[PDB]
Amino acid sequence: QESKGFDYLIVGAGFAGSVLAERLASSGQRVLIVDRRPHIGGNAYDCYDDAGVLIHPYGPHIFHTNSKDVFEYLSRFTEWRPYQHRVLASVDGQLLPIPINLDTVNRLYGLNLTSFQVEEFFASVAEKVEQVRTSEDVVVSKVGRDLYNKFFRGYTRKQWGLDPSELDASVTARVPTRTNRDNRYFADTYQAMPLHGYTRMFQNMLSSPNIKVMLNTDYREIADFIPFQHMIYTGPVDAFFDFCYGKLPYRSLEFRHETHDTEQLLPTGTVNYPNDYAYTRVSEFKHITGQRHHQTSVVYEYPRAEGDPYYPVPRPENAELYKKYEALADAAQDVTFVGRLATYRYYNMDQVVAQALATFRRLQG
Amino acid sequence: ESKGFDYLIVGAGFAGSVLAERLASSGQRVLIVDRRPHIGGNAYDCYDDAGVLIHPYGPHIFHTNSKDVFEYLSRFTEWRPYQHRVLASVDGQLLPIPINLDTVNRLYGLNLTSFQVEEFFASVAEKVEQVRTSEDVVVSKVGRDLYNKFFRGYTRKQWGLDPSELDASVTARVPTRTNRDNRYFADTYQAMPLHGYTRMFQNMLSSPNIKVMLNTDYREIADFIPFQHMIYTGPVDAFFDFCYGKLPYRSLEFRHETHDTEQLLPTGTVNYPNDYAYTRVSEFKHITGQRHHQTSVVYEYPRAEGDPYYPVPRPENAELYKKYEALADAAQDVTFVGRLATYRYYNMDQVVAQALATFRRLQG
Ligand SMILES: Cc1cc2nc3c(=O)[nH]c(=O)nc-3n(C[C@H](O)[C@H](O)[C@H](O)COP(=O)(O)OP(=O)(O)OC[C@H]3O[C@@H](n4cnc5c(N)ncnc54)[C@H](O)[C@@H]3O)c2cc1C
Ligand SMILES: Cc1cc2nc3c(=O)[nH]c(=O)nc-3n(C[C@H](O)[C@H](O)[C@H](O)COP(=O)(O)OP(=O)(O)OC[C@H]3O[C@@H](n4cnc5c(N)ncnc54)[C@H](O)[C@@H]3O)c2cc1C
Ligand SMILES: O=c1ccn([C@@H]2O[C@H](COP(=O)(O)OP(=O)(O)O)[C@@H](O)[C@H]2O)c(=O)[nH]1
Numbered sequence: 107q108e109s110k111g112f113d114y115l116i117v118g119a120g121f122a123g124s125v126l127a128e129r130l131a132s133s134g135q136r137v138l139i140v141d142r143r144p145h146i147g148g149n150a151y152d153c154y155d156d157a158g159v160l161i162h163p164y165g166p167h168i169f170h171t172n173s174k175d176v177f178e179y180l181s182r183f184t185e186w187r188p189y190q191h192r193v194l195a196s197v198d199g200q201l202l203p204i205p206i207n208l209d210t211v212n213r214l215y216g217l218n219l220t221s222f223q224v225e226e227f228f229a230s231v232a233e234k235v236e237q238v239r240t241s242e243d244v245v246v247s248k249v250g251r252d253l254y255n256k257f258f259r260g261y262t263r264k265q266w267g268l269d270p271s272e273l274d275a276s277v278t279a280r281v282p283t284r285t286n287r288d289n290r291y292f293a294d295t296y297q298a299m300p301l302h303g304y305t306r307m308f309q310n311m312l313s314s315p316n317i318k319v320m321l322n323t324d325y326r327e328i329a330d331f332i333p334f335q336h337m338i339y340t341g342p343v344d345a346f347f348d349f350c351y352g353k354l355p356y357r358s359l360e361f362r363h364e365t366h367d368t369e370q371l372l373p374t375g376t377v378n379y380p381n382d383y384a385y386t387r388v389s390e391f392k393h394i395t396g397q398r399h400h401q402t403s404v405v406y407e408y409p410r411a412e413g414d415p416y417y418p419v420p421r422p423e424n425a426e427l428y429k430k431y432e433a434l435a436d437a438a439q440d441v442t443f444v445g446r447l448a449t450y451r452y453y454n455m456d457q458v459v460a461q462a463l464a465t466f467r468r469l470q471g
Numbered sequence: 472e473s474k475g476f477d478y479l480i481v482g483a484g485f486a487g488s489v490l491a492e493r494l495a496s497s498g499q500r501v502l503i504v505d506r507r508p509h510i511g512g513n514a515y516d517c518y519d520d521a522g523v524l525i526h527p528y529g530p531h532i533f534h535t536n537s538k539d540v541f542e543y544l545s546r547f548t549e550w551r552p553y554q555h556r557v558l559a560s561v562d563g564q565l566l567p568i569p570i571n572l573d574t575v576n577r578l579y580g581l582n583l584t585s586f587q588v589e590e591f592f593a594s595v596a597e598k599v600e601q602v603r604t605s606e607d608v609v610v611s612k613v614g615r616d617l618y619n620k621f622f623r624g625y626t627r628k629q630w631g632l633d634p635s636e637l638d639a640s641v642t643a644r645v646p647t648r649t650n651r652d653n654r655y656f657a658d659t660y661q662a663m664p665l666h667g668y669t670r671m672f673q674n675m676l677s678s679p680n681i682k683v684m685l686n687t688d689y690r691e692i693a694d695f696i697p698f699q700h701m702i703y704t705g706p707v708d709a710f711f712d713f714c715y716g717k718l719p720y721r722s723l724e725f726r727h728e729t730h731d732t733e734q735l736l737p738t739g740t741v742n743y744p745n746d747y748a749y750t751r752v753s754e755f756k757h758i759t760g761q762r763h764h765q766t767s768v769v770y771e772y773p774r775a776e777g778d779p780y781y782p783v784p785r786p787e788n789a790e791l792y793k794k795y796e797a798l799a800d801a802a803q804d805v806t807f808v809g810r811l812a813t814y815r816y817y818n819m820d821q822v823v824a825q826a827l828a829t830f831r832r833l834q835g
């Protein structure tokens with residue numbers, strides 16, 4: 107009776123949205139992809155700054171996956187610059203590797219333990235657990251309270267506004283503790299940055315004539331009058347349902363960007379600050395991108411309880427609230443929910459990509 | 472909450488973007504649309520594979536004599552002062568163009584003063600009764616030899632027509648000088664948007680009343696997007712499905728290159744009237760002021776096929792355009808604005824003025 111219009115209206119041009127727009131469009135669907143922001147990319151958006159330095163406006167995005175499927179998929183849209191991110195935490199005035207490893211321990215205390223001895227060292231400080239439900243429990247019961255306190259407690263209190271004990275184990279479990287001497291932030295098979303940035307990658311992803319891209323646009327601003335047959339939604343679950351069950355908490359961030367007139371400011375990709383400063387970490391994009399430049403650009407991150415949602419807050423009382431919403435989302439007939447914000451999952455880029463690719467299969471089936 | 476738009480603007484170049492900003496500031500609801508995946512239309516600039524700030528559709532040098540236009544654009548961008556300089560490759564030399572005192576002195580091995588090069592120009596000019604073509608314009612000012620060395624081959628190369636087959640308004644665009652002024656433009660306001668056109672454009676479209684749709688031909692969505700008025704900045708002939716035949720526009724192919732050196736050319740653009748397939752090379756860093764270890768240049772090759780860039784001004788074409796101009800003047804809720812829409816050889820600043828004036832009309 108009324109126009110059929112687009113087969114899909116996708117809300118959010120992040121990895122979640124863009125992947126599905128590419129997949130759907132290649133199968134011949136007509137797609138409108140909208141984002142409240144004036145650009146594509148979601149968080150992973152990158153751009154050149156006032157000084158001509160390629161940066162990440164929303165904090166550093168380092169690509170990493172163990173999934174051949176995901177890596178070969180994204181390779182359809184970008185070439186790679188091999189890169190393995192390394193993070194140093196500022197503790198006791200030293201820059202020490204994080205995740206904690208054999209060197210972290212020897213350097214901090216002045217030991218000369220072997221990998222074999224550090225296993226035993228942990229075993230002798232480890233608290234015994236027992237439950238193993240919280241973020242405190244994962245660390246403490248592997249490396250004991252002193253290391254927990256110097257590396258995790260403060261940082262976590264600062265990033266989440268919550269003590270490690272008030273967070274699900276899944277949070278701090280994301281950072282392993284090692285007895286070897288690996289100083290890499292990630293141990294995944296494929297670690298590489300999109301050669302020319304993420305944005306270039308998104309552009310190729312969204313290039314299909316079957317995809318129309320609409321920026322500076324809340325879907326609600328067009329959904330009353332633009333015809334569409336199905337919606338893939340990728341923003342926060344709560345807002346889509348009017349906060350009917352109340353605000354699902356999402357941690358946010360302020361970013362302070364700065365340019366310095368020197369080639370290198372930091373000894374590595376990111377320096378973390380668990381025990382000092384308003385900020386949690388500083389990053390220097392050139393280590394990440396490989397860009398040569400007479401100057402250098404860095405971003406300082408400030409955890410904010412308010413503002414654009416960036417992280418779900420995994421804990422039992424948020425997981426309970428999310429179920430209220432998951433139930434509504436599932437029941438919603440012509441709407442598919444996918445991505446970090448829309449499914450309330452602490453997902454990495456590769457993971458969202460894999461989730462979106464799984465969804466596309468579901469839709470096709 | 473909203474139920475549609477007041478304006479559907481086809482084209483996110485200067486023409487449409489200016490109108491979008493003015494309309495929206497006056498509280499109108501605006502959906503701007505481009506076939507391309509990016510705004511800025513023709514002036515769109517971006518960073519290449521090497522991190523050099525370039526112009527994918529040919530160097531765009533901003534210059535205006537209009538205090539009004541310049542102050543308008545100033546709300547959206549800061550400026551890097553820059554007065555573009557072109558050098559023409561003639562007889563194995565790099566000579567200033569516009570032809571000036573120094574072009575003439577260095578070419579012929581002369582030592583004329585400014586007062587003398589006027590008599591020299593008068594002494595070789597060919598008097599034409601009435602000045603009709605691009606040949607007449609050049610020849611009645613500097614003579615048949617300079618015309619040949621600097622205009623004929625270049626023109627034949629650029630347009631695929633002799634300057635004799637082109638309206639006078641084409642070569643008249645390039646002043647002939649008795650002074651030693653070596654700028655391509657003598658305009659009052661000469662500067663580039665500090666951080667590039669695209670960043671300027673982004674500000675321009677930033678209002679909440681502006682919805683931006685890319686990768687989209689208007690025809691794909693006009694049947695189901697509610698809008699009052701349409702502003703169209705595409706090609707006129709195409710809008711009327713080519714009913715009277717193709718309106719001829721001239722096109723361009725761009726070959727971009729990056730070199731491992733800080734500077735490849737002695738100025739921003741070198742023109743080749745008499746040599747090579749390309750009409751010109753430009754070095755972007757000259758224009759943007761960017762600092763960089765390497766450098767990116769672009770060679771422009773004239774093409775008869777491709778995206779429309781130039782209208783071909785001449786009697787048979789102005790006549791074909793009147794036919795289309797008629798249909799557009801009839802078009803009820805369509806305003807035609809822009810270099811393509813109105814088939815005019817307009818500069819960036821000139822299109823900005825066209826748009827501001829259209830906004831004033833559209834408002835009273
Ligand atoms: C600071 C930071 C650093 C990170 N670093 C890494 C890293 O190093 N490695 C890694 O793998 N992952 C990293 N991530 C996570 C990564 O960004 C996510 O996995 C990714 O964002 C998932 O993409 P998405 O599509 O699910 O969500 P998003 O990128 O958040 O996209 C959702 C989009 O939908 C839009 N939207 C929401 N509501 C509406 C609506 N009302 N109307 C229109 N548009 C709407 C939003 O503007 C947003 O752009 C990082 C995240 C942050 C915040
Ligand atoms: C190579 C070159 C160099 C130039 N150098 C200078 C210079 O140095 N100084 C100067 O002042 N001027 C210069 N100009 C002129 C300048 O580019 C134009 O004056 C200016 O772009 C006019 O803006 P516009 O909006 O009218 O046209 P455009 O910028 O061409 O915008 C038209 C847009 O509408 C879109 N469109 C058309 N049809 C449709 C449709 N069917 N559906 C959706 N979208 C559509 C097109 O994709 C295009 O992006 C140059 C032009 C060229 C080609
Ligand atoms: O130096 C650190 C880094 C990690 N974390 C904890 O580990 C969690 C996961 O951090 P990760 O870097 O894996 O996720 P990200 O914050 O980068 O998105 C953090 O939120 C912190 O609670 C920490 O305590 N100290």
Ligand SMILES: OC[C@@H](O)[C@H](O)[C@@H](O)CO
Nearest residue numbers: 551552553554759760761
């Ligand atoms: O005003 C003098 C110069 O022309 C400048 O524009 C500099 O080159 C800036 O980079």
